[PDB]
Each structure stands twice: as structure tokens, then as C-alpha cells.
A paper describes a structure:
However, an emerging pathogen, human parechovirus 3 (HPeV3) can cause severe central nervous system infections such as meningitis, and is a leading cause of neonatal sepsis. We utilized cryo-electron microscopy and image reconstruction to analyse the structure of HPeV3 on its own and in complex with a human monoclonal antibody Fab. The HPeV3 capsid is composed of 60 copies of three β-jellyroll proteins, VP0, VP1 and VP3 in a T=1, pseudo T=3 arrangement. The virion structure shows that VP1 pocket-binding drugs, such as pleconaril, are unlikely to bind to HPeV; that VP0 is an important protein for stabilizing the inner surface of the capsid, and finally, that the assembly of HPeV is most likely controlled by multiple interactions of the genome with the capsid, through conserved amino acids in VP1 and VP3 and stem-loop structures in the RNA.
We determined a 4.3 Å resolution HPeV3 structure using electron cryo-microscopy and single particle analysis. Homology models of capsid proteins VP0, VP1 and VP3 were used as starting models to generate an atomic model of HPeV3 constrained by the density from the reconstruction. Unusually for a picornavirus, we showed by polyacrylamide gel electrophoresis protein analysis and from the structure, that VP0 does not undergo autocatalytic cleavage into VP4 (N-terminal) and VP2 (C-terminal) in the virion. Similar to many picornaviruses, HPeV3 possesses an open channel at each fivefold vertex and a canyon for potential receptor and antibody binding, however, it is wide and shallow. Five VP3 N termini come together to form an annulus at the base of the channel, giving intra-pentamer stability. Instead the VP0 N terminus straddles an adjacent threefold on the inner surface of the capsid, forming a loop that stabilises the twofold-related VP0 from another pentamer (pentamers 1 and 3), a conformation that has not been previously observed to our knowledge. Unusually, about 25% of the genomic RNA is highly ordered, and at high occupancy in the reconstruction. Finger-like RNA densities come into close contact with capsid proteins VP1 and VP3 around the vertices that could accommodate about 30 nucleotides. Moreover, we identified the conserved regions in the N terminus of VP3 (T20-R26, T47-T65), hZ helix and the βIC terminus regions of VP1 (R202-N205) as the structured RNA interaction sites. We revealed the unusual stability of these capsids at the intra-pentamer level by VP3 interactions and at the inter-pentamer by VP0, and propose that the uncoating mechanism of the HPeV genome will be significantly different to that of other picornaviruses.
Author numbering:
A (entry chain A): 123 to 221
B (entry chain A): 24 to 221
C (entry chain C): 20 to 125
D (entry chain C): 73 to 282
E (entry chain B), F (entry chain B), G (entry chain B): 20 to 256
Amino acid sequence: EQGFLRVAHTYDTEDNRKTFLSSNGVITIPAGEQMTLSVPFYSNKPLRTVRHDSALGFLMCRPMMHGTTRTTAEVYISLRCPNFFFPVPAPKPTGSRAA
Amino acid sequence: QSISPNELGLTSAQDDGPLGNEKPNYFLNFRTMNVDIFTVSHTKVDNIFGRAWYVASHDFNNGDTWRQKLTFPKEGHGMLSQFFAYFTGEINIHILYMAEQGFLRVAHTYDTEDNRKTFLSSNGVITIPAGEQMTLSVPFYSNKPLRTVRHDSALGFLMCRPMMHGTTRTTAEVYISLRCPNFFFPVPAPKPTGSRAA
Amino acid sequence: LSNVETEANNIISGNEVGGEIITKVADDASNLLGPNSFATTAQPENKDVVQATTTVNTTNLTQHPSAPTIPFTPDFRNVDNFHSMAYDITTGDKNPSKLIRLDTAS
Amino acid sequence: TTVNTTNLTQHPSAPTIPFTPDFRNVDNFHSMAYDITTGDKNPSKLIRLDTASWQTSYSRQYKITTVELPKSFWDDTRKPAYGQAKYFAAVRCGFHFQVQVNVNQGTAGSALVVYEPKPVIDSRQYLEFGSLTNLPHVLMNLAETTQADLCIPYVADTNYVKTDSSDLGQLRVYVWTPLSVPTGASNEVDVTVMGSLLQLDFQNPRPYGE
Amino acid sequence: TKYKWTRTKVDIAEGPGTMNMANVLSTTGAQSVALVGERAFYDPRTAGSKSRFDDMIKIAQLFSVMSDNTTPSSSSGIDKYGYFDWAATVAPQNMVHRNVVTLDQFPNLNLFMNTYSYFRGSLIIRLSIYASTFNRGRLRMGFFPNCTHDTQLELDNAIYTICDIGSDNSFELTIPYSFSTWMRKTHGHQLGLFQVEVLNRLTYNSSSPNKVHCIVQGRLGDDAKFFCPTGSLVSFQ
Amino acid sequence: TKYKWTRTKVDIAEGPGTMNMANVLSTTGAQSVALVGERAFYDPRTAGSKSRFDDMIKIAQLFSVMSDNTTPSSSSGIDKYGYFDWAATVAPQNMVHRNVVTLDQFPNLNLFMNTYSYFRGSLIIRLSIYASTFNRGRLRMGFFPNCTHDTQLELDNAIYTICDIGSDNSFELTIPYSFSTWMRKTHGHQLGLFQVEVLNRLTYNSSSPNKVHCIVQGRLGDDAKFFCPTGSLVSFQ
Amino acid sequence: TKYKWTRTKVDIAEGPGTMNMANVLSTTGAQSVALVGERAFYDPRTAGSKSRFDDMIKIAQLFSVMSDNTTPSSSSGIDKYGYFDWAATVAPQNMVHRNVVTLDQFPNLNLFMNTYSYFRGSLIIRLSIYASTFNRGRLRMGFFPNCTHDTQLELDNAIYTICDIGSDNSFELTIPYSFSTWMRKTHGHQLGLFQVEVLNRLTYNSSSPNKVHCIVQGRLGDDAKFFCPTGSLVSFQ
């Protein structure tokens, strides 16, 4: 909606909840704005992450009020300063190509 | 060396002894290893209340204006609320306004006390334009010092006037976070609040 | 008793000459000495303490104490202030003595 | 106190030792020179794990003999992978492997030994073979080298792994160049792997069976 | 008056939209913003106490009985939680109790696991037996850190801790932190198993209580700590 | 010309919407903004006086009679505020007056409490008696700092302050700041109680005024001060 | 409170619209922005290994057989890739194989050229022949770096590399990077041509394998590297 509405978002962890989401975090992003966050990590049980779960997680998106018209969102990712190493390279040959 | 309730000395606890033996887990040699970066405050105070979220509330019927002044309970709170007993702090308020396509304005401030007539703009103002971000920090004062009851609650009021009108509906949001809590906290952690009697 | 516990130890060191492992001499026996040690210590230490508190004009002699049991870091006072009605303090020490009316008309 | 078990007792009597005990710690004198061993050091040694099969029915990409995850010392009826690990539930250990394939001179065929490290063995997907060739492997040319050495430090997602259930590494011998058969000579060269275990840790007790 | 001047900043990587957050907050690192109102700042005082503290785990560290209806009981009627050590149970291999397991226990660790979800640290446990001075007895305490389904005398296998009563109570046995990974989930994922086992009887004389019992309260520390928040909750409570 | 360059700021924690406030202001800390218009700056002069001052409580500090109709009176008709010390009232335990209580008093402290709401400090009070030089008399002044409902000779209990007239007036009695907390509310919450009590008569000769009287004016200081503003108001006035 | 003040920045060369990018990213140079959430930072550990590495071309550098059906074969049925060096082919000028050409080869260089498109570096090639110890033979290996349409004994012209088997395998021949410009396109633009040529026979005795063969696997390095990304792809795979 033309600058009508707001979007609340955060993550995650874990399995399930009831609940008030704003506890585990919040990031009020106004209508027609830019796509900005960085998460750090933690429990996030350390041990790294399965590698092909995938991909161990969840995002939580609540579009608050409503403006009676349709609504749409976009999600892009980039992971920075990857510790990665990477570890046990480069087994999972993933030579699938079996596309 | 195996303790004795109703015996000395205080509410302290201990090192709980370096048993087993070893053995190799088995009893001790537990040394802390900080995993995180370390902010480490995740166990510590301050930070956690530093985060925010809380009450998602206060819908708005258009007609007409004025107030009503709303009582911020401070809890609630009700999402991260699992945390508390004590009394005090010097807030940080977040205000949000979903209304007419950039048509209108919202005036807001607080508070103190009981009642008034009145021109509100005296005790303060914060003209927040349509569709904008939720930003204030209050300091304190009379605010009779003495801290604050702790479960009033929560000693207060917010005052919200939506100025002119654009003939369509109107909505608002209020989030809270209290920073640098002096808190201490005091008399911890009595109000066991083990309700769970949910 | 006292030396016997350290005899259980000195046996432990008996088999400790075996780095395995390490050892301390299964199972963690390395302490069979106990915590100084099965004696006494506090509980029925009695007399194990006897107390004999005192207050103005009244003594309390009590024979089986437990523990002071203070809540956290009490540091209790003695205003304050902050202030709490600047009047200090008073009497009796100092309220009992002041001018007062005593008379009449004729 | 003893390993994992404390005994708090309220009314002691006395140590009561017999004469000047000075007890040991062989001896010797000697009592079967073998010392000591394990567990500490018996639980870890080479061990047999394999069997026989071969000939020409196998195309190059056709699997051969998969050797099981860390459960395969447990369910083995001999060494520790039975006694002590049938007590404790948690295992963390390195791995050392000698694989033996001996043929009769005059023939040539390749064997391949790879150690997939739990990559959701997924379906491996069909074109991924090289692929399968980036891993900590070993390529035996049977014309010459009759044995092959390998060392795997284990890596897994978790910092520990359940004894028989959650596993980690799975050996796989794949054939490479189905074997050549001069006429005539024996039809079966079979296979063997004999393993050994590095400095090894069990932890986290639990009752007997579970 | 053109310098230049100023020209320019123009990053803006934005999108001047939080910017002022909302979003909301995390992790603080956003202090009193768009200040303020105004201005100075307060100057409080105790008392109270000189207790300004972070932590958190200092406020855990307080022995607290496990719920009400654990067994359950209290009342519920009597027991009178802790079951009863009462003659008939002899057979040095028995007693009763049970965990399953867990972390509720609702002595406020309910609320911790109802706000944070992750942690590392032990659950120091206390058994406390009440009987008069005359009678005496010993009993043990099994706890397995995995754990399984009940699961008998392997309680003789695992951890131990002998108990003599006595002059005077109470007792203790700890657990070291035992699990893979580093953090653990704080919901109903896993924890161990707990029995108390009568080995010899708790005797009684002709003038005596004839019935003697227990209470058991745990607490977490002192190595422990929690990682990250979450909304949970238990509605709410 | 790309450095870089500039790239970037992009905080913005915003929401470039106050930003420029509105909101409005608090606490100043926002000086002449989006300047300006332009440019220089002024260069004033007295007189006037060399009276550039903050404070505020310097402008309180001025003895000012309490309202008009306090008793009320003035006129209203006579009295002629302060009642009347006039013979008949003898009985050394009596006189008349009264507070309830309060803080209105409308000698401009009305407007202070009609803008600020909170404070700490005393209400220094003055009684001023007018009679000619011949006649004389004594009288006291009760004030309780709580306070209650009338409430007799306990005015002998509480604070005091004797009065002789005289050559010449006027008088004084103070109060120390008495309450819990630290700030007090400035609306109709609480204050004390005030009587004047005739103990001996105010006599008169055969050539004399025969009727003598009072005026009473309070002021706040010099320890005092006010905290925070508020919109109030008294409409408006 | 007006300084000034602040006034001003006002570059803004913007358009506060990325600013916060989106756009999206390139080239990183945009770290954790509008931070964050919050706050500290992690502290991981191996193992794993002490393998924190950039590169990339370190992960290329691993000899990997060319596809499955290259010839194709494997199975497909036998061959049993590498064709067969088997008696009948003598005529020292022949053998069989072929490139056309190329860069697929799908041993993961498929995925490299399916993400990056450009590079410079060679394609080190390996032939590996399997036969028992008795029999022996020589054979060559032609590769032209342009290249053309098949194209005979000019394979005697171009590059060479003799082969003796042997005790024991395997082998090698390299190529230097050969082309104009500097980068090359990584799609189906160009590469060379490859045969293996029997010159003398691979003999056999009366007790012997009688059939001997090859496998051929290439890899890229160690001079190589890739330039720029692209979306490609092979759907997806």
C-alpha cells in the first residue's frame, strides 16, 4: 500500500512458540523501504550447521495492520566474513548436474 | 562441608566444593569458556532490557480527538515479561503511526500526574508526521523520586492527540524499552511472580 | 579418626604410583580423607554455640541457635535523606522537653 | 569419593588396615610381561572388519563393500566396541585404517577407497562421481601396491556422537576398472580392512542396556 | 556561500527508514536517540541497598523447591512432597521418585526458559530429609545425564551420592554439564533421570516419629549463563 | 569522481522525520536550527538594569498577601483581612484562622503551580499586626505539617512562635520541608494547618484604637526549586 | 540551541534510496549495515581443522575424471571409460579419443563455469593406464590449442608427450594458456583438441590381461583464477 502500512520481522531459532514475537526481536520496516539487517549467531547451537538441512532456521514475518489491498515482500541473503574455513572441503562434490 | 539449612551464614552460596575428585567430568573442573564475542551481557542486565518489543496495542477510533490518556502499565509487558520483581528505571519510548497517506500529524507527550484541562503542548510536544518512526527517550523527575511502586501499575500515563482529521481511519503503535536501568535491581528478587498460575 | 582418613589417602597414593590415571586411585578416592572431616562440624556442634543476646533492660538467653540469615547486602540506615521532612530527630532525646503552656486567666 | 560416585557417611569408625600393606603395582615378577593394557589400551587396535566378493559382474561405478559407521566397533563381538561402549553412551575418537587387497600377479584393476563424512548420503545424485573424488581418499593400483594406508581425523556436526545410533564416517570401497581375468587363474581376490583407534574417550554414563 | 560546501555525504545505503530503526531494537547499541526531553539527567539514591548489579545468574543461584504438584503433591493432600521414607520399602534396591525430567520445575526457572532459550550449566540439586534426632538411616540418589525410560539398578551404574541422616541434614549432589554441541535447547528437548533409593531402612524407636521424609530443590549455577532472547511464551502467563 | 567517495553515513536510525523534531522541543538542546535568516546577530543594551538573570526562584522570594477572599474578605466588607484581634475572644486558648491549606494562596504561586508541577522547599510565612503604640499583647501561631481536620490545642503540641506587639512588627515563623519521597505534587494533594491563637488580650486605653488586626503573607524560598513543566491549566486564565 | 548548529551536510547526491542499497550488494564494501541485533559477536572453534581459507582455486586443483558419458561410457556398458588399448589398432598412426572440447567435463568445473564467467590458466591433464606388470607399450598424446575439426597427423606437428607403460603409471602433459586478449569466455566459445595415438602395440603374453586401458582426468591450476560473477545457469541445477 502506498506508504500505508508497516512490516515487523525477526528470527530464529527454533521450533515453535505461542506467542508475542517482539520478544525475540523486532525491526519495524515501513512501506516501500530498503532491505536491511545483519544477524550474528549464537544458540544457534554452536556446532556449526548440518550443511544440508536445510538450512536450519526460520524467518518470522508479521504484516501488522491491513490496508484492504494486496501485499508483497522480498527476501535476499548475503552472508559476510564467513568463518566457514571452509570445513572438510570440498566433499559434498554436488556434481549433481543431474539437473 | 556438606552445608546445613537453617545454619550459617547468609544468602550468598559458595563454590559448592571442588569434588569429586575429577572424575574426569564428573563433579567439577567446570571452567567457564565464553563462547560469544563476547558481549556476555546475555546473562547480564542492562542489555536485555535494552532490547524492546512489548505491548502491541492502542488501536484508534477516529472520533474525535483529545486523548484518552492511556495508562502504560510497563507490564504487561507482555512478551519478554518473564523477567522481573523489582522497581524503577528511566524509559525509552517508541511511537509508530499508521494513517492517511502522508496526510496528517500526531502530537504526543507524558507524564505525570492526575489530570489537567488543558493545553497539552506545555508539558511537551513531539510532532510525528504520518508514516514515520517510533522515537523518544524520557529522563525522569517528579516523577516523585522514591522509585516507583513496582506493580501499580505502572505509575504514569501517555498523552496522544491526533490533531486534524482526514476522514478515514487511524492507527498507532507503542513499543517500550528502558535503558541503563539503575534498578540495581532493588530488593531482589522478592516478588517471586511464580504465578505460572497462568 | 583424623589420622585414619589420611591413611585411606596414603593408601590411595599407595596405588597412585600408577599414572593410570591419573589416578587418582579409583574412584576419585583421592579424598577419602573427608572434609576436616566427618567431624564435627557445625550442626550439633553444641554447645554448638549458645547465644546470649541483649537489649535494653532485657536479656534473651537462648540455647539452640540457627543462623543470622540476612537478606542481600543490607547496609541499613539512618536517613536518607532525602530529605524526609527535614525535622530531626527528635528527643526524647528531644520531643519530651519543650515550652509548653500551663496557665489561665483571672 | 570415587569416580562418578560420592559416598557421604555420617558416623565413621576407623581405617583398620592389616599389617604394613605397601601394596602395588606389579611385582613383577614377571606376571606375563604383557602390560597393561588400554582401556588405556585394549579397546583400540586393528581389528578385522571385512569379507569376500568380486569378479566381473561389477561395472566400474557399481558399489563394492561399505563398512559401517562407529557402531561397527560396538556391534563387533570382540574388543571395546562391546564391553566399555556397551556401558557408556558417548564416543569421540580418531580413526586409523589399513586396507588390504592382495591379488595374484599378472592381473590389473583398480580399487577406490573413500571416506564419506556424513553428507546426508542424500541420493549422491547420479553425475556427482568426481565429485566422490575430492574426498580424503586412496586409489589402489592392484598391479603393484598390495596394501594401502589411511588416516581419518573424524569431523562431525555435533561435538559428540551417540554410541551406536548417531554415526559419522562410512567407509566405501568402490571398484574402478572392473578386474581383468587372464585365462586362467582364480576368480576372487576378496577384500579386507583392518582398523585401529586413536586416543579414545567415552563419557556420559547411562544404565546397562538402554 | 557555496564552498563546495558540505557536498556531500550521500551514502546513504538507504532508504532513510531505520535509520531510526523500527525494526525496533537490537542490540541496544541504540542509546537514547532523537533526543530527548530535556535535558540534564537524574541523580537517584538508595535505599534499597548498594545493589546495582547486572546478572541475572546471581538472581538464579537461589535454592527453590520444585513446583507444587511435582510428584505431585503439596498438599496434595499429604504427601507432603518428597514422597515418604516409611518402613515397608526396605529391600535395599528400590525407593521412589522420578524426573521426566526436565526443567520444570517451576521455581522461576520456568520464567527463565520462558524468556531465553539456550544455555550451559549444571543443575545443582539438594535433598533435605526431616526426622528427629533418634532414628537414622542411609539412602542413595541416582541421576543419569541423558536420559532414558526407567531404567533400574543401572542407577547403581551411573552417578551416586550416599546419604546419612543424621546430624544434621541436608545434602547435595551436583551434575557436570553433559551434552554434545555447546548450547542446549531450553524447551522439552532433553534432560536426565532421578531416583532416590532406599538401601537400609530408616528405623524407629518406641517413642519416635515412625515417619520421616524429604524435600528436594534444585538451582542452576555457578558456571551457567544464558544466550539470546526469544518471545516464548506460556500465555503470557 | 567516485572515491569511494563519501559512502557513507546511512545510520539513519530513521525515518528523516524529526530529525527536525516536531515532536517540537525538549529540552532545547535544539538551538537555532535549519538556520537561519540571516546572518549576524543582535547587540542589545540596557536600561533597564544590569539584570540578566536565570531564576525563577529569585522572582519568587517576594512576600505577597494571600489572595483576596482567603478568609475570605478584602473588602469583603471589613474585615479587612486577617480577621480582627478584638476583645471578647480572650480565653487564652482560642483565636481564629485556617488553612485547608494549601498553595492558593493566589499570589502568583498560583501561576507557578499552574505551570510547573513538583517542588521542594518551605513556605516562609509572615504575620503582621497593626495597632498604635499604646496597647500591647501577645499571641501565638500554630502550623502542622501534615495535616488534619481542626484539630485543637495540639496546636500547643506542634510548632510554635510567640508574638509580642509591640515596637514594632512584624514577625516570622518558618517551616522546614516535611514530607516523604522528595518532590511533592503541587496540586490539591496535601499541606498543613494554620491558626492564630489569642493567649492574652490585646488591651486598650480610654484613648486608643480599641480594634487591632493582622495581615498574613507567605513566600517560598530560599532553598526551593521546581522540577519539570506541565500544561496545567486554570483556563487559561 | 542554534549554533549554527550542525547545518549542514545536504550533499546528498540523492535520493536517500540506496543509500541503503537494494540495488543489493557489490562489492561487499557494504558490511553489516543498519546494525544490528545485538550486540557482541561470536567466538567459534574447530574441528574441523585449522582450515580457514579464501581460495577457491585451492579447491580446484583436484584431479577429477571427466564426466561419465564423455566418450561416452561408464558403464556405459564397458567401456569402462578411456576407450580400450586393445590389439588390432596397431598402424603406429591412429588411436582414438576426442575433445570438442571443451570445459565439460563435468567434474565441478561445470559449476565454476556455471557461476563465474571468465578466466586464465591451463588445463593440466592426466592419462592413467592400467595393465599388469608383464606387458608393455608406448603411446603418444596430441592436443592442439585452438582448435579445429579432426585434423590428422598434424597431431604429429603440434604438442606431444610420449608414454611408456610400464612401472608404473600414471602420466601428465600440460598446456600453457594460449589465446589472444587476456580473459577468455567460459561458455562454449573455444578450446583445443585431444587424441591418444597408438604408435607401437601394447603386447600380451600367453598368461596376461590381453586388454589394457585408460582413464583421463583434468584439473585447472596452479596459475589460474577467475574474474567476475554471473547468474548463469544450468537450471539451476
